[PDB]
Amino acid sequence: TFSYTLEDHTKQAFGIMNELRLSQQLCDVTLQVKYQDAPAAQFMAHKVVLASSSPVFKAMFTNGLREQGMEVVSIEGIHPKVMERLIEFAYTASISMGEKCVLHVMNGAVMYQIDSVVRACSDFLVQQLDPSNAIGIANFAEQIGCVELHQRAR
Amino acid sequence: TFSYTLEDHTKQAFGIMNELRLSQQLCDVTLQVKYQDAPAAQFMAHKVVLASSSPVFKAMFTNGLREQGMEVVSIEGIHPKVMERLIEFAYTASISMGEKCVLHVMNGAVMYQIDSVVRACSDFLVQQLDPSNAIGIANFAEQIGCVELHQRAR
Amino acid sequence: DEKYVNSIWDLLKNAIQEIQRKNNSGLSFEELYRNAYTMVLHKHGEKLYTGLREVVTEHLINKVREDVLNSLNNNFLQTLNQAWNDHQTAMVMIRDILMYMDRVYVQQNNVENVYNLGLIIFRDQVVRYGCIRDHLRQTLLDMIARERKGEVVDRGAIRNACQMLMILGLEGRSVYEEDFEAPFLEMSAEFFQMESQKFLAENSASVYIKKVEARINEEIERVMHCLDKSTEEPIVKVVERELISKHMKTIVEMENSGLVHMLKNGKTEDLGCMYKLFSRVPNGLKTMCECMSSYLREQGKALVSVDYRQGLDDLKSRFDRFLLESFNNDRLFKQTIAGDFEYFLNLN
Amino acid sequence: DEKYVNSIWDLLKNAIQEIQRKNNSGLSFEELYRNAYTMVLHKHGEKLYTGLREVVTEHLINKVREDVLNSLNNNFLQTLNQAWNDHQTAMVMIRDILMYMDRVYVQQNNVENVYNLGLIIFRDQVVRYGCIRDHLRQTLLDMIARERKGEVVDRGAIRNACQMLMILGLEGRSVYEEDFEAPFLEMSAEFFQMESQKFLAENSASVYIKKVEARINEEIERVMHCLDKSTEEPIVKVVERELISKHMKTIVEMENSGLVHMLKNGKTEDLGCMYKLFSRVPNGLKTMCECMSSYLREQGKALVSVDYRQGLDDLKSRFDRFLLESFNNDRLFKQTIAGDFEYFLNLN
């Protein structure tokens, strides 16, 4: 006849899980992010939390293809800088971005689809507008894929 | 120079993960809860979320003992009714309890240590007090372990 | 450069065909997703979408349609259902690889997403080809007709086939309504019609009513185990129309078995079962009342034309008993009984 | 029943010893935790706690103490540090098995938890046994003394040993302060003392000051790589006390090299380095001022007893230059220079 809820718990549990990762313990996956300029990186992490975070990951390890039980598989998207900042989000609900790399960070969110952490850049950039730098901005919005600022582009 | 947070995310992510369990997919553990009267039960689940939830689980699969990589190991605590209601909490932050089994449910939270879901029974029971049934209540509080209602026992 | 786009497409076309061949085990998800992502990113979503429709259509016409057509006279439903599960399984992996197109391009160009496109090609090229359309309609209807006649049929094959017609309706029942529901209700109305002619031809009114309840229940249990829940109401109305509505005055006035007779022998339950059945249809209770008014008025004028008062109190008490115990103290029945009493008590 | 409690304890005692033997691989966590849970649940936490202290003490005295005592003259720190890591590793698993006692019983009876008890038994029975206590103190101090003399030493063995003394302080530094910091500061004060006698005996005041800065920096870098951050302040004060405080008047008045001499040849930087060093200690700047007052007043009376005015402006400008460029426009120095000028300018 009862039924309870604890709002402090998804947060708390999520902390405990980060700590479980950062001890590089209990992980079921390891990612060799490798891109042209930068040297290859290995990130130990939990399959299940990655899927919680991104749909491109949910499907990666999913009923899908040869990433069924790999324990170790590559990613060749962007600098592993952004896969780190991203995983930081996927385990902490928070992401520290920079006045410079936010392009690469956002394009990251875009490629593996983290529409939350993408819309947070959508609203990240509105702040320090430049009529000087507006040009490249709109270039991103149309190139990016989501014409979501391309309209809001004044 | 920025830094964002998304409070809706631990919740949302946690839903996606439940759904990943209930599809009996991506799981790294399987529990054969087995107790005297009841027939043995198998629960597929994620090691990492169980540890997020309970410290007795964090340590179970931990650097500790032979539960290092088992994929399948028993538990002989209470009826798997309560391990189900409990796992429901561990994946949803919510637990539907009954006017009857709440003893077994709470003793569950007690044994694997879920002090949140234990204090929620601590305050569960204060509601339907009986000066008739108060006796057995205090018997629980002293037997239980935590003399946390034993004092509040009027 | 466009030639590498052709190479991306060759990788995707080969991959899709390997998935259609169920050889997805050994395909790198990341490379197929990333390449599809790059194609859409450089605004080649239109080229990618056309290719997808071509490969999926090509696959379902040259292979799936023939496989289904070859099972027409030998375990048809098993193979068709097999083709449907294989289609759904392949399309999930295919929809995953083109997820980026699915979130940017299909949104911009008001076109159906990868999964719905897969359903449309399957619906139009397989389920509704023609020879297949007619054979699935005959089969499902033939099964319901055998079961109604007392035969035992595979209810699961029907549930899987009807569910398929529902999904192919694209969050609608258009496919299920046109291909299955409409002919099902037609042939059912005819079956219940010949059934009513026989039941009216032999059985008493009470037995007829019990057999109508039994038929109603039989069709509901059939809907719960074979058909779609949304078909419950239409089938019952057809059962209600053919067995009750079209014979309302016939049933109540059935010679030596009807309503007036039940009224004469105080068969309380039989009148209550009649009420329960006739309250389902419009003008059902109106017919029961017109029949009752004729009987109650006929009884009252003959009674008015210590024993006389006990006879009138037993007649009033009898019909008050009938009203509470059988007619559920119906507003219509209470007004009718009262109005009739107000007619014959005022006459002299 | 109590005899099965003895069986639970036998299972736990055997398990603990297998963990101490590092044979934890093959121990069912659940059964040891559940049994320990059941023991505490029936209020036998006192019996379980006593047993734990007995087995842990028994293990560290009969095996660990002897192993450490046997390495006294052959790679002592490596084995002691090895015993400490093995102790911490075993105690984690041991603290996990008795988690239920750790949350109910130790809370009720104001006793140290399983992990702290493990630290206490290790601290008292090993680190502070006696022969071990003295040998670890001599070794660490011997290493710092060799390094200060120019030898190269294993800084990591010191960092691991000092960290251990810190932890055994039980979220305090009592163990580290008594066993290490106190004797370290003692022997350091003596080393810096003999060092000052030599430096004062040969080198100029400028060279002495540069060597004091170099010694201060050398000890800080040593604290960052070997000792505990909380030792930074005490060691610098000892360096400051033995090299500066105790020789304040000696340094400024060093014949043909001191403050007045730097003032005579306008060695601006040398005076600034002296200020930087003397501002660290109490009464440092007071000594510099008393020395300066004596020189500035002596210069001013001889000057007052176009060339006379340019001589006085160059002397005022010279000391204003000294105040801004060397004395950081110090409040004390500005008041002193002004007060001295107010004395000799008022005399005649």
Numbering used by the authors:
A (entry chain A), B (entry chain A): 51 to 204
C (entry chain B), D (entry chain B): 26 to 330, 339 to 381
Article excerpt on this structure:
KEAP1 promotes the ubiquitin-dependent degradation of NRF2 by assembling into a CUL3-dependent ubiquitin ligase complex. Oxidative and electrophilic stress inhibit KEAP1 allowing NRF2 to accumulate for the transactivation of stress response genes.
To date there are no structures of the KEAP1-CUL3 interaction nor binding data to show the contributions of different domains to their binding affinity. We determined a crystal structure of the BTB and 3-box domains of human KEAP1 in complex with the CUL3 N-terminal domain that showed a heterotetrameric assembly with 2:2 stoichiometry. To support the structural data, we developed a versatile TR-FRET-based assay system to profile the binding of BTB-domain-containing proteins to CUL3 and determine the contribution of distinct protein features, revealing the importance of the CUL3 N-terminal extension for high affinity binding. We further provide direct evidence that the investigational drug CDDO does not disrupt the KEAP1-CUL3 interaction, even at high concentrations, but reduces the affinity of KEAP1-CUL3 binding.
